[PDB]
Amino acid sequence: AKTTQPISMDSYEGQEVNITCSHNNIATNDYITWYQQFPSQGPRFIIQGYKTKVTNEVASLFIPADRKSSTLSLPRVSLSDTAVYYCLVGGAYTGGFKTIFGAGTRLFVKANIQNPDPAVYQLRDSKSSDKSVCLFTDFDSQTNVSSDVYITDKCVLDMRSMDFKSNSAVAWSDFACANAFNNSI
Amino acid sequence: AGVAQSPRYKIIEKRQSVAFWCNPISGHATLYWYQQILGQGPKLLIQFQNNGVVDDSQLPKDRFSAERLKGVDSTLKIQPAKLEDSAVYLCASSLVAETYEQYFGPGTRLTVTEDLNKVFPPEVVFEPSEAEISHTQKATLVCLATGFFPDHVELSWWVNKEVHSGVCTDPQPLKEQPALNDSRYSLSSRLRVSATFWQNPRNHFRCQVQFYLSENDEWTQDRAKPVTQIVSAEAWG
Amino acid sequence: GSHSMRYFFTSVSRPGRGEPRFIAVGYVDDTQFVRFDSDAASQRMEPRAPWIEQEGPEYWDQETRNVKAQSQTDRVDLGTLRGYYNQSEAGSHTIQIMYGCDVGSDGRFLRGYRQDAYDGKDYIALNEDLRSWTAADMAAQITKRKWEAAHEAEQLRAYLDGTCVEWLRRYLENGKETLQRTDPPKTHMTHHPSDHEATLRCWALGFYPAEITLTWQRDGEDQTQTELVETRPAGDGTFQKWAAVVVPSGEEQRYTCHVQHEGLPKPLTLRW
Amino acid sequence: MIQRTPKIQVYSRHPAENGKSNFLNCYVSGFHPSDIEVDLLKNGERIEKVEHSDLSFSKDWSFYLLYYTEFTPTEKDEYACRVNHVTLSQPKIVKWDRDM
Amino acid sequence: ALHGGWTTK
């Protein structure tokens, strides 16, 4: 594997995201290719270049003169751009024939919570009325959600009709969602 | 039309066989088989150019075999599967060769369990908390899918019509017994709607979980065989 | 002196009788060293010179993969160009491609080439600067615009001034005994009789490389008024050529045949 | 010109000597398209074991091929090359002249 | 060796 890229990257929606990949042993017949893999999907081709900067409607790919590295540039990321981004180097020759995806870079896009209302609520089962869970909700994206205590990770939903996005986490009595950097109610 | 693959989900037991099938884009000369285990990128298993094998370097040939005899569709076989075979197997094709774009199929999710008795259907809708309507003028619903194995489910929300706005399903479920292998899983999802919508009584909210053995390996015991089914639950408000 | 490596490709469509016929040949100077025939049973790149046979299996796997990729590319292009020219499926059509590089006596890059044809006429050609194209007709404009904006054209340029030169140097060293040789022509003249008129044929046999110049001259004056045959292969790696002129009898020593070849110390002059 | 008729040369690899083994060559060049039928004849009959070079072309995109076989020339035996092509109404026969 | 990694017409 000729490629080394960051394990993961975090970014807020609307920001430009630049992912740099190091490939100092690149060969003359090598191309630089990037793939993007959404959850529950196979990888999808997004861009390929050789020397000159390449731009399409998905991304731009910048390659310096020495070709020892490359940078994938996502113009303005949305929440849907959360995916794995693989930098690939190879070509039609014995040392480059095999396709090697590697670990890639896990890009996580965070919502811009305009009106944070960090508050834990308690929902009750429709049928088993004595069952309850922790609902940590309306926290901004800055916080990190950290026995038989079951804690899911933070999730961001989009109410497209009202331009409202809300983070949430669920835990299963409830003092709060366990031991995290939490706040307010 | 892109790459077609079959099947989508598969659950089998250690030391038994499975055969994956793939149909590439018509006229494509190169076909690839990839194995993607959880938390890693895809790894090339076998590559075909026309009907001939062109890359075998990373194929575990004691168990792994593949054929594309007429140069169109390929079958990948595992015999006999090991516990480490649990992965997503992807098929891809390119018009000419590896420097071209590789079009990927939907993939085949394979879980290899120690015993077919360890697979279970999901258990399924916590109504919105009254403090949340008062505080935010909104209504969040929480749905829990518990006790299922393997991790082959497709959660969805149906309102009177499937809906995707205001829905956040967990990216990856958690292990009910993290330190126990082949443990059951649990998945959570949230749907929040405006207060007025949940004030109305004529709205039917459904949290639908689609589970993924079949009758061929029938076991015939008391608790029903966890056949690929749909365990669902609902609320009206 | 200078040296060259060339690859030639022919794809001929076969309407209604399967895939097109595809033949590839590779040359170092005037010596062929590889071939591929889609109608052959091996379905592999095959050696045609002793010095290339010493390449390991990775070379032959790489060459077989890339020749089939070239063949598939041309098979796709046959269908594409048929639409460009609004042609029917009934007729047969041919795509020809030649590319390679030239190096000097020092082994340094001199020039690179890539020329494409359709039905025996120019279709598109890479210009000498290796970053612009010359399209021969309106259908080729579509390809030219596509290839002008293709990052693959950057790698083709890097192959022609880079990879192509490096492999040619490797081949020249491996085939040093045969590729670096220069066989001078063996020359002789024949006399073949109406009356007071005959033909003088000036022969040149067993020479390598194929480049040669044969000229007839009367009284020191160039006589291009003569029959010249095309240089032909003897079958053993050497070439043959002859030049014949009609002569009124008695004028046999007025006529001189001049032989120019890089294997000769000085140009030869032949008198009957 | 859309279709180009083949040029044909018939000759031996080495200077002809009766009773001595040699190679008989038929060099066809300058033709288009590549579809061509070439036979070597001995006394008007097709020579069975005949080989040919791999198809290639010149700068003007016209094809050339060399057909060859082992033979021992004699005083009496007649050798020729028979070529058929889309540009030819009937097969063209060129006789072997050891002075050419 | 052959050129590789080309594109269609």
**Together in a domain, C149 and C251:** no
Cα-flanking dihedrals φ and ψ of residue C167, to 5°?
-65, -40
Tell me, yes or no, whether A100 and A117 share the same domain: no
**What is the length of chain C?**
272
Contacts of B28 in chain E (CB under 8 A): none
The verdict on E3 touching B (C-beta cutoff 8 Å) is no
If asked whether residues A143 and A57 sit together in one domain, one would say: no
Tokens of residue C153, six digits: 């054209």
- A65 & A153 share domain: no
Tell which of D12, D24, D57 to mutate to test the C interface (max C CBs under 10 Å). D57
**Is chain A adjacent to chain E, meaning 3+ CB pairs within 8 angstroms?**
yes
- Residue numbers in the known binding site of C for a peptide antigen are 7, 73, 84, 116, 143, 146, 159, 171
* Domain edge (last residue) among C180, C199, C219: C180
Looking at the structure, do residues C104 and C88 belong to the same domain, yes or no? yes
For A12, A14, A83, A91, A153, the CA distances from A77, given in Å and listed in that order, are 8, 5, 11, 30, 21
Q: Which residues contact A166 (CB under 8 A, 6 or more apart)?
A: A113, A137, A138, A156, A157, A159, B192
- Cα D99 to chain centroid distance, Å, stands at 16
Whether residue B53 is found in the same domain as residue B91: yes
Rounded CA separation C213/C208 (Å): 13
d(CA C26, CA C40): 17
In a shared domain, residues A101 and A146:
no
What are the φ and ψ backbone dihedral angles of B137, each rounded to 5 degrees? 60, 40
Instruction: Give residue for tokens 């020397």.
Output: A51
Question: Alpha-carbon distance B205 to A162, whole Å?
Answer: 20
- CB atoms under 10 Å from CB of D75, counted, come to 6
A166, β-bridge pairs = A157
**Subunit contact B99:E5, Cβ cutoff 8 A:** yes
Kindly report the CATH number assigned to the domain that includes residue C13: 3.30.500.10
Q: Is C141 left (phi over 0), alpha (psi -120 to 50) or beta?
A: alpha
Q: Distance between CA C108 and CA C162 in Å, rounded? A: 10
Residues C116/C123, Cβ–Cβ less than 8 Å:
yes
| DSSP-assigned beta bridge partners for residue A141 | none
Chain C residues touching E5 at Cβ < 8 A: 152, 155
3-state SS, residue D16: coil
CB atoms within 10 A of CB D73: 18
In sequence order, what are the residues at sequence separation of 6 or more whose Cβ sits closer than 8 angstroms to the Cβ of residue C166?
A: none
The verdict on C150 and C191 lying in the same domain is no
The CATH number linked to C208 is 2.60.40.10
Angle ∠(B17,B21,B25) on CA atoms, nearest 5: 165
Omega before C184 within 30 of 0, i.e. cis: no
Encoding tokens for residue B46?
């076998």
Q: What is the 3-state secondary structure (H, E, C) of chain A?
A: CCCECCCEEEEECCCCEEEEEECCCCCCCCEEEEEEECCCCCEEEEEEECCCCEECCCCEEECCCCCCEEEEEECCCCHHHCEEEEEEEECCCCCCCCCECCCCEEEEEECCCCCCCCEEEEEEECCCCCCEEEEEECCCCCCCCCCCCCECCCEEEEECCCCEEEEEEEECCCCCCCCCCCCCC
Selected for mutation to probe chain B from A40, A79, A99, A151 (highest B CB count within 10 Å) is A99
Angle (nearest 5°) at CA B32 between E5 and B228: 150
Q: In angstroms, rounded to a whole number, what is the distance separating the alpha carbons of residues C164 and C102? A: 9
Q: Supply the range of the domain harboring residue C25.
A: 3-180
Beta-strand pair C198-207/C186-192 = antiparallel
Distance from CA of C243 to the nearest CA of D (A): 10
- B120 and B85 co-located in one domain: no
Distance, in Å, from the CA atom of B196 to the CA atom of B133, rounded to the nearest integer, reads: 9
Strands D45-46 and D36-42: antiparallel
* CB contact burial A107-140 (16+ within 10 A = b; e otherwise): bebbbebeebebbbbebbbbeeeeebbbbbbbbb
Ramachandran angles phi, psi of B183, nearest 5°: -75, 160
Strands, E assignment, C19-158: 21-28, 31-37, 46-47, 94-103, 109-118, 121-126, 133-135
| Structure token pair of residue C30 | 């005037």
Question: Under 8 Å CB-to-CB from A128, ≥6 apart: which residues?
Answer: none
How far is Cα C247 from Cα C229, in angstroms, rounded to an integer?
Answer: 18
DSSP per position, B9-63: EEEEESS--EEEEEE-STT--EEEEEEE-TTS--EEEEEEETTEEEE-TT--TTT
The encoded tokens of residue A18 equal: 């630049």
Question: Between B and C, how many CB-CB pairs are < 8 A?
Answer: 21
Pairing mode of beta strands C94-103, B9-13 = unpaired
The torsion region of residue A45 among left (phi > 0), alpha (psi -120 to 50) and beta comes to beta
Number of domains in chain A: 2
Q: Are residues C116 and C48 in the same domain?
A: yes
Range of the domain at B191: 115-237
Q: Calculate helix-pair angle for C57-84, C138-148, nearest 10 degrees.
A: 130
Among B81, B114, B147, which residue terminates a domain?
A: B114
Same domain, C23 and C138: yes
Nearest neighbour of D99 by CB, restricted to C192, C232, C236: C192
CA count, 13 A, side-chain hemisphere, B107? 20
Last residue of a domain, one of A111, A135, A151: A111
The helix/strand/coil state of D65 is strand
Q: How far is C39 from chain A (nearest CA, A)?
A: 24
Q: Which of C180, C214, C244 is the last residue of a domain?
A: C180
A15 lies in the same domain as A98: yes
Residues B77 and B138 in one domain: no
Same domain, C41 and C72: yes
CA distance A144 to B97: 44
- Considering the domain architecture, whether residues B109 and B131 belong to the same structural domain is answered as no
- CB contact set of B24 (below 8 Å; sequence gap of 6+): B3, B31, B72, B73, B74, B91, B92, B93, B103
How many whole angstroms separate alpha carbon A85 and alpha carbon A35? Answer: 6
C8: nearest Cα among C78, C74, C98, C77: C98
Alpha-carbon distance C176 to nearest alpha carbon in chain D (angstroms): 24
Measured between alpha carbons, how far is B108 from A18 in angstroms, rounded to an integer?
A: 32
If asked whether residues B77 and B122 sit together in one domain, one would say no
- Are the beta carbons of D64 and D28 closer than 8 angstroms? yes
How open is the CA angle D58-D64-D70, to the nearest 5 degrees?
140
In the numeric block, the tokens 């390119």 are attached to B94
Other CB atoms within 10 Å distance of the CB of residue C27: 19
- Distance from C-alpha of B112 to C-alpha of B108, rounded to nearest angstrom: 13
Same domain, residue pair A27 and A75: yes
Q: Which two tokens stand for residue C50?
A: 């002793």
**Do residues B87 and B160 share a domain?**
no
Residue at which a domain ends, from A111, A144, A171: A111
Structural domain count of chain C:
2
What helix, strand, coil percent values describe chain B, rounded to 5? 10, 45, 45
Whether residue A35 is found in the same domain as residue A91: yes
Cβ-contact A179, A146 below 8 angstroms: yes
CA angle D3, D9, D10 (to 5 degrees): 140
| C261: its two tokens | 């070849």
Q: Any residues with CB less than 8 A from the CB of A132 and at least 6 apart, and which?
A: A122, A123, A124, A125, A172, A173, A174, B126
As given in the structure block, the two tokens for residue D8 are: 């044909």
Give the separation between CA A111 and CA B47, rounded to whole angstroms: 41
Distance set, CA B165 to CA A108, B168, B190 (Å)? 20, 9, 11
Determine whether the interchain pair E5/B95 forms a contact, defined as Cβ–Cβ distance below 8 Å.
no
CA gap D40, D79 in Å, rounded:
7
Name, in order, each residue with C-beta under 8 angstroms of E2's C-beta and a sequence gap of 6 or more. C7, C26, C63, C66, C67, C70
Q: Half-sphere exposure of residue D66, counting CA atoms within 13 Å on the CB side?
A: 17
* Rounded distance between C-alpha atoms, residue B87 and residue B89, angstroms: 6
Give the rounded distance of the alpha carbon of D25 from its chain centre: 6
Structural domain ending residue among the three candidates C153, C180, C207 = C180
Give C12's contacts in chain D (Cβ within 8 Å).
33-35
Contact A96, A33 (CB under 8 A): no
Q: CA angle, corner A85, sides to A137 and A158, nearest 5?
A: 25
**Cα distance from D9 to chain C (closest Cα, Å)?**
8
Cα–Cα distance between C233 and C105 in angstroms, integer? 25
Decide if C151 and A49 are in contact by the 8 Å CB cutoff: yes
Q: Which of B233, B234, B140, B231 is nearest to B190 (CA)?
A: B140
Q: Which residue of chain C is at minimal alpha-carbon distance from A49?
A: C151
Domain that holds residue A52: 1-111
Q: Are residues B1 and B40 in the same domain?
A: yes
Residue C10: closest CA among D65, B48, E1, B97 = D65
Count of H-run helices and E-run strands, chain E: 0, 0
Distance of CA B172 to CAs A107, A155, B126, B232, Å? 16, 11, 20, 19
Same domain, C192 and C157: no
Chain mean position to CA B193: 28
Alpha-carbon span B102 to B30, nearest angstrom: 9
The closest of A92, A101, A83, A118 to A8, measured between CA atoms, is A83
Domain count, chain B: 2
| Residue A86 bridge partners (DSSP) | A35
* C151 and C256 fall within a common domain: no
Residue D65, CB half-sphere, CA atoms under 13 Å: how many?
21
Q: Which of B174, B212, B175, B205 is nearest to B190 (CA)?
A: B205
A61: closest chain C residue by CA? C151
- Do A119 and A185 lie in one domain? The reply is yes
Q: Do residues B189 and B202 lie in contact, with contact meaning Cβ atoms separated by under 8 Å?
A: no
Chains contacting E (3 or more CB pairs within 8 Å): A, B, C
C33 and C152 housed in the same domain: yes
Burial class (CB in 10 A: 0-12, 13-18, 19+), A147: exposed
Contact indicator for C23, C69 with CB cutoff of 8 Å: no
Distances (CA, A) of A8 to A5, A18, B171, C102: 9, 12, 16, 48
